[PDB]
Amino acid sequence: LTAKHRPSVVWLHNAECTGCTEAAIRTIKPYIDALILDTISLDYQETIMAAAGEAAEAALHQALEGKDGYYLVVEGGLPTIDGGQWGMVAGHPMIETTKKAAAKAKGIICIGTCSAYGGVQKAKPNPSQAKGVSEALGVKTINIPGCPPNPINFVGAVVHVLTKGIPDLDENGRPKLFYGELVHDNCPRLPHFEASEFAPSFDSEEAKKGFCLYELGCKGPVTYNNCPKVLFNQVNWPVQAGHPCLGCSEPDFWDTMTPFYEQG
Amino acid sequence: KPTPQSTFTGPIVVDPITRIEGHLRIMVEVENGKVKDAWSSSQLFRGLEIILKGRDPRDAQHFTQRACGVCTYVHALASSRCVDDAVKVSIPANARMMRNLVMASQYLHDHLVHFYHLHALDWVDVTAALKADPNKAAKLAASIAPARPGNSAKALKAVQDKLKAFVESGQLGIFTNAYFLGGHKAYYLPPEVDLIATAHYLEALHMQVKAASAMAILGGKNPHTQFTVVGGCSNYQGLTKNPLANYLALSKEVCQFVNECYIPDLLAVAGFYKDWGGIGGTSNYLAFGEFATDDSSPEKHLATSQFPSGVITGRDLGKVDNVDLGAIYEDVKYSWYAPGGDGKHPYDGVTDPKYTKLDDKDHYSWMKAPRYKGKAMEVGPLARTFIAYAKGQPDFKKVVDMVLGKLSVPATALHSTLGRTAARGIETAIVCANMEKWIKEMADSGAKDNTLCAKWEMPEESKGVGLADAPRGALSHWIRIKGKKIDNFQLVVPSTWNLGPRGAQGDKSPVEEALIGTPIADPKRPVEILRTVHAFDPCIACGVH
Numbered sequence: 001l002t003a004k005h006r007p008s009v010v011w012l013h014n015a016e017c018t019g020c021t022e023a024a025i026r027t028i029k030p031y032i033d034a035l036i037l038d039t040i041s042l043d044y045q046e047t048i049m050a051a052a053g054e055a056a057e058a059a060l061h062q063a064l065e066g067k068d069g070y071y072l073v074v075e076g077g078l079p080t081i082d083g084g085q086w087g088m089v090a091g092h093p094m095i096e097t098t099k100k101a102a103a104k105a106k107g108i109i110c111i112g113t114c115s116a117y118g119g120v121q122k123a124k125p126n127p128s129q130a131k132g133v134s135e136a137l138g139v140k141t142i143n144i145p146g147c148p149p150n151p152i153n154f155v156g157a158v159v160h161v162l163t164k165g166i167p168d169l170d171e172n173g174r175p176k177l178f179y180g181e182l183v184h185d186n187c188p189r190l191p192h193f194e195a196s197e198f199a200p201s202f203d204s205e206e207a208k209k210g211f212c213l214y215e216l217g218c219k220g221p222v223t224y225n226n227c228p229k230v231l232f233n234q235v236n237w238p239v240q241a242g243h244p245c246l247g248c249s250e251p252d253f254w255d256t257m258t259p260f261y262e263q264g
Numbered sequence: 265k266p267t268p269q270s271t272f273t274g275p276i277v278v279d280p281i282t283r284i285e286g287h288l289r290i291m292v293e294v295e296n297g298k299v300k301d302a303w304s305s306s307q308l309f310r311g312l313e314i315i316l317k318g319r320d321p322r323d324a325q326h327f328t329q330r331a332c333g334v335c336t337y338v339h340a341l342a343s344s345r346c347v348d349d350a351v352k353v354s355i356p357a358n359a360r361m362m363r364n365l366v367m368a369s370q371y372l373h374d375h376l377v378h379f380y381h382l383h384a385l386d387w388v389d390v391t392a393a394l395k396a397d398p399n400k401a402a403k404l405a406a407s408i409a410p411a412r413p414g415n416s417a418k419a420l421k422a423v424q425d426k427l428k429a430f431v432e433s434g435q436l437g438i439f440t441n442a443y444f445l446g447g448h449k450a451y452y453l454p455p456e457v458d459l460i461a462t463a464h465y466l467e468a469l470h471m472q473v474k475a476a477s478a479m480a481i482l483g484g485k486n487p488h489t490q491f492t493v494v495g496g497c498s499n500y501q502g503l504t505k506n507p508l509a510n511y512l513a514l515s516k517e518v519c520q521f522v523n524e525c526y527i528p529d530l531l532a533v534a535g536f537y538k539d540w541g542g543i544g545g546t547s548n549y550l551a552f553g554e555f556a557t558d559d560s561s562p563e564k565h566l567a568t569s570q571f572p573s574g575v576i577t578g579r580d581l582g583k584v585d586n587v588d589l590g591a592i593y594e595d596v597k598y599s600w601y602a603p604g605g606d607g608k609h610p611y612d613g614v615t616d617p618k619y620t621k622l623d624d625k626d627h628y629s630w631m632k633a634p635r636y637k638g639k640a641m642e643v644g645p646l647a648r649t650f651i652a653y654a655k656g657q658p659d660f661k662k663v664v665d666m667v668l669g670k671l672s673v674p675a676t677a678l679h680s681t682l683g684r685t686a687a688r689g690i691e692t693a694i695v696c697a698n699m700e701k702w703i704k705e706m707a708d709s710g711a712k713d714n715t716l717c718a719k720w721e722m723p724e725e726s727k728g729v730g731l732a733d734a735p736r737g738a739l740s741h742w743i744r745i746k747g748k749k750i751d752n753f754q755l756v757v758p759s760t761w762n763l764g765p766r767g768a769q770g771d772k773s774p775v776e777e778a779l780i781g782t783p784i785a786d787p788k789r790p791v792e793i794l795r796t797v798h799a800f801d802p803c804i805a806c807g808v809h
């Protein structure tokens with residue numbers, strides 16, 4: 001309810017591309033305006049907040065000191081080289097502010113593979129010594145990975161946390177509600193996979209016929225996500241668009257799932 | 265009548281710059297209420313170029329796409345053009361068409377979100393909208409914009425009641441400590457215009473979902489598309505009738521919103537801030553062009569881009585030069601990189617991070633400083649608009665003249681923060697007017713022959729460049745391949761051109777120059793800094809990578 005005290009959410013941006021913020025605002029159940037006007041009090045969020053500079057820093061501190069507490073959403077990994085100085089907001093290393101916010105949060109939701117597991121800046125040779133949030137700070141996190149995750153998964157997690165408690169998590173901290181099944185197990189090309197009907201190239205007649213993309217590097221068989229079941233943007237997902245899965249909800253996929261166009 | 269301006273003398277630091285992508289600190293010296301010196305200090309490094317070394321060139325597009333999720337897709341496209349050039353494959357006509365249409369869809373999504381959700385709060389006092397008469401607001405809307413149910417007195421009253429309940433709650437959320445709270449001298453709009461714009465801000469939150477859905481029909485998903493491959497595209501389904509019918513329908517809805525709301529709001533806001541036509545100008549413009557009819561090579565891209573390529577120097581619209589790709593280099597003298605790295609063409613780019621300390625005047629940004637013949641270049645919609653207008657591109661001549669007439673200003677008034685903001689809307693309208701033609705072209709071609717990916721072979725050694733004009737401007741990716749692997753991979757990104765630091769000669773970048781002369785009505789709430797900075801549409805994850 002708009003006029004009620006709505007649960008406070010503080011959203012921090014660390015070493016990120018903002019693709020996760022962008023994914024969150026693609027939500028349609030509810031739309032983002034309904035979420036922030038009716039369901040949560042979104043009290044800090046750099047991409048969209050009005051205040052800048054000292055006024056924005058004052059808004060963060062007002063939120064962190066709120067009597068009712070707050071939930072913390074983190075987007076992006078933590079660069080730790082040089083005392084954290086390669087990623088700073090308001091003159092403070094990202095690792096310092098995230099540590100402070102995490103210490104008193106009612107719950108921590110890591111949106112995206114970067115905050116969950118370290119993500120793209122952690123890929124070898126990791127020049128910034130980037131870490132995932134739990135990796136760097138040793139706090140338990142609810143992880144909503146993918147690059148970016150489906151808004152269904154993130155908003156669903158937020159709503160679950162506020163309404164029901166912590167959802168059941170897998171060994172990688174991911175809610176089983178969204179991450180319990182392999183991409184591959186729900187792929188419409190699975191009969192082609194079972195029959196060893198694989199496209200050998202993107203120009204092939206096999207590709208035009210919609211054959212399985214395993215020989216072209218598809219990581220669906222080792223990736224936990226709900227992509228084929230829920231789709232993206234109510235219209236599509238990568239294999240429906242003829243492209244292999246990259247494994248983007250898996251930890252360290254940049255180094256474990258590459259080369260992307262091979263199984264090697 | 266005159267532009268508000270305090271007597272403040274001293275430094276102002278704004279960190280974080282909010283309502284941008286990524287992490288930017290602006291520092292300025294102010295004397296008697298006007299900015300006299302400025303520094304653009306990017307505050308995060310990730311190092312994608314370092315990460316790419318030794319990897320499979322086919323993988324580059326998937327890593328570089330994650331340079332940024334606001335301008336999602338564009339780096340996947342630049343990397344794909346880059347590797348296509350390096351392996352010397354010419355993509356099929358259907359692939360050119362599909363890639364360019366995904367770019368068009370990205371312009372629409374990106375520019376709409378920028379104007380409403382990133383920029384508007386610099387110009388629009390949302391709390392003042394609570395003082396508006398919704399009946400007066402509806403009558404005003406009826407005079408300045410096409411008739412629509414969303415602009416009715418009932419609709420505007422519902423927006424106002426919702427805003428009221430939210431403000432009155434005392435939990436102001438993203439409006440907490442907004443610069444316009446309690447009124448601000450630099451905010452000029454009548455309450456009625458605030459309410460119309462706020463109503464559209466909310467509508468735009470829903471419309472951007474549709475814009476992204478359109479993009480995802482061809483792109484696989486949004487954010488971070490997954491439909492490009494070396495040689496072309498993978499998405500055969502995107503050439504078929506029913507998906508393209510849905511893509512057209514969604515696009516038409518988004519474009520109706522551009523024409524009914526974005527352009528009239530932009531013009532109404534610009535009408536009240538005509539003084540901003542004299543603040544924030546620069547002199548040099550660069551574009552690589554976009555929407556080419558021949559993407560078989562970078563040279564063919566530059567030559568056949570429908571939003572044309574070119575170089576303007578010293579505001580001289582009488583002399584558009586062709587782009588010389590060999591004239592591009594990047595300096596690091598004032599950046600957080602090791603000594604020796606100045607003057608590097610991107611094929612010879614070096615990325616050797618070396619931090620010093622916050623606000624070190626000798627090294628103050630994680631962005632490199634790209635220069636062109638020793639000059640800084642502004643890139644983006646204003647660059648594209650001036651280049652097209654100077655070249656006589658008929659859609660740009662028509663829409664630019666429409667704006668100049670509405671605002672009653674000469675074309676020189678466009679060398680400004682107001683012109684930069686207007687140019688973003690001008691090109692959005694032009695993309696919208698071209699969508700149906702481009703969609704029909706692909707629907708017909710794809711029906712005739714659904715060829716979408718060309719055959720190619722990886723060379724042992726090669727080099728290639730991929731060019732695109734992304735929503736924020738001229739984007740280029742540059743690869744050296746050795747032993748069939750990435751030996752060097754350099755990104756030079758529009759926000760690097762616009763918001764990087766000084767170059768080797770100590771010369772201010774476009775945003776640093778644009779900020780000189782900025783009036784500051786209240787140094788505690790320096791909205792004027794945000795106006796100019798936001799007009800460049802900064803993306804720091806893009807600029808630094």
Ligand code: SF4
Binds near residue numbers: 113148149330
């Ligand atoms: S998880 Fe992916 S989309 Fe989200 S911030 Fe990281 S790189 Fe960007």
Ligand code: SF4
Binds near residue numbers: 185211212214
């Ligand atoms: S395309 Fe990928 S997810 Fe689908 S059946 Fe083949 S391997 Fe599995």
Ligand code: FCO
Binds near residue numbers: 332339
């Ligand atoms: N548009 C955009 Fe992003 C930036 N700067 C890129 O490329």
Ligand code: F3S
Binds near residue numbers: 183
């Ligand atoms: S790449 Fe990611 S978005 Fe789904 S299809 Fe694969 S897990």
Ligand SMILES: [Mg+2]
Binds near residue numbers: 313632756757808
């Ligand atoms: Mg670079």
Ligand code: NI
Binds near residue numbers: 806
């Ligand atoms: Ni960007």
